[PDB]
């Protein structure tokens, strides 16, 4: 399963799929944090 839906994100803790537009916002749509535990800035 090399993806979910359009450029969406998959979390290796659990397996869920999240709307990847929300990988750099500071709150966490995945079952952990991996949205943005790697999307720093300034
Ligand atoms: Ca998020």
Swiss-Prot record:
Most abundant in liver, brain and lung. Disulfide bonds join 4-17, 11-30, 24-39. Ca(2+) 3 binds at residues 22, 25, 27, 29, 35-36. It is found in: Golgi outpost; Cytoplasm, Cytoskeleton, Microtubule organizing center. Residues 2-41 form the LDL-receptor class A domain. Cleaved into a 85 kDa membrane-spanning subunit (LRP-85) and a 515 kDa large extracellular domain (LRP-515) that remains non-covalently associated. Gamma-secretase-dependent cleavage of LRP-85 releases the intracellular domain from the membrane. The N-terminus is blocked. Heterodimer of an 85-kDa membrane-bound carboxyl subunit and a non-covalently attached 515-kDa N-terminal subunit. Intracellular domain interacts with MAFB. Found in a complex with PID1/PCLI1, LRP1 and CUBNI. Interacts with SNX17, PID1/PCLI1, PDGF and CUBN. The intracellular domain interacts with SHC1, GULP1 and DAB1. Can weakly interact (via NPXY motif) with DAB2 (via PID domain); the interaction is enhanced by tyrosine phosphorylation of the NPXY motif. Interacts with MDK; promotes neuronal survival. Interacts with LRPAP1; this interaction is followed by rapid internalization. (Microbial infection) Interacts with bacterial exotoxins. Belongs to the LDLR family. It is linked to Keratosis pilaris atrophicans: A group of rare genodermatoses characterized by keratotic follicular papules, variable degrees of inflammation, and secondary atrophic scarring. Most cases are associated with an atopic diathesis and keratosis pilaris on the extensor extremities. KPA is comprised of three distinct clinical subtypes: keratosis pilaris atrophicans faciei, atrophoderma vermiculatum, and keratosis follicularis spinulosa decalvans. Affected individuals may present with features overlapping the 3 subtypes. Developmental dysplasia of the hip 3: An autosomal dominant form of congenital dysplasia of the hip, a common skeletal anomaly in which the normal seating of the femoral head in the acetabulum is disrupted. Its severity ranges from mild instability of the femoral head with slight capsular laxity, permitting minimal lateral displacement, through moderate lateral displacement of the femoral head, without loss of contact of the head with the acetabulum, up to complete dislocation of the femoral head from the acetabulum. Endocytic receptor involved in endocytosis and in phagocytosis of apoptotic cells. Required for early embryonic development. Involved in cellular lipid homeostasis. Involved in the plasma clearance of chylomicron remnants and activated LRPAP1 (alpha 2-macroglobulin), as well as the local metabolism of complexes between plasminogen activators and their endogenous inhibitors. Acts as an LRPAP1 alpha-2-macroglobulin receptor. Acts as TAU/MAPT receptor and controls the endocytosis of TAU/MAPT as well as its subsequent spread. (Microbial infection) Functions as a receptor for Pseudomonas aeruginosa exotoxin A. This is Prolow-density lipoprotein receptor-related protein 1. The gene is LRP1.
């Amino acid at each position: 399963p090399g993806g979910c839906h359009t450029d969406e994100f998959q979390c290796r803790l659990d397996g869920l799929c999240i709307p990847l537009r929300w990988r750099c916002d500071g709150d966490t749509d995945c079952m952990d944090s991996s949205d943005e535990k790697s999307c720093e800035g300034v």
